[PDB]
Amino acid sequence: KVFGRCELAAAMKRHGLDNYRGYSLGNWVCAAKFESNFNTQATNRNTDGSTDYGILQINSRWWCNDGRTPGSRNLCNIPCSALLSSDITASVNCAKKIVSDGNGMNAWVAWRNRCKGTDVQAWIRGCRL
């Protein structure tokens, strides 16, 4: 599924992401924009052999099981394929764990490089929420 901007904002709010760990909804939408361009099916291989999955590009090195990342952990206790669903519940639940791990949203390199410190409210501008 490719979400619209406000559509994703609404879905994220519905699943309790808005202001989760103090990160406003615009931060989460911005992260999704630059991680996946709002595409729930996005997958990207990392040089080290792990893979990033879904709307928030969650990494099999730590967070989900894909059966092909030697050494890795599955701290969200989910198959990585669950992070590709049209329904964002699994990705949201896992993102909540990631953002609570100590470094906040810096876990998402694209968030740090492209969203952090910017006018993130623009991402929810005009949205009926």
Curated annotation (Swiss-Prot):
Pfam families hit by this protein: Lys
UniProt domain C-type lysozyme: residue ranges: 1-129
GO MF annotations in UniProt: beta-N-acetylglucosaminidase activity; identical protein binding; lysozyme activity
Active-site positions on this chain: E35, D52
Tissues/organs with expression: In the egg white and polymorphonuclear leukocytes.
Keywords: Allergen, Antimicrobial, Bacteriolytic enzyme, Disulfide bond, Glycosidase, Hydrolase, Secreted, Signal
Bridged cysteine pairs (disulfide): C6-C127, C30-C115, C64-C80, C76-C94
Known role: Lysozymes have primarily a bacteriolytic function; those in tissues and body fluids are associated with the monocyte-macrophage system and enhance the activity of immunoagents. Has bacteriolytic activity against M.luteus.
Name under which the protein is recorded: Lysozyme C
Organism: Gallus gallus
Organism placement in taxonomy: Eukaryota, Metazoa, Chordata, Craniata, Vertebrata
Gene assigned in the entry: LYZ
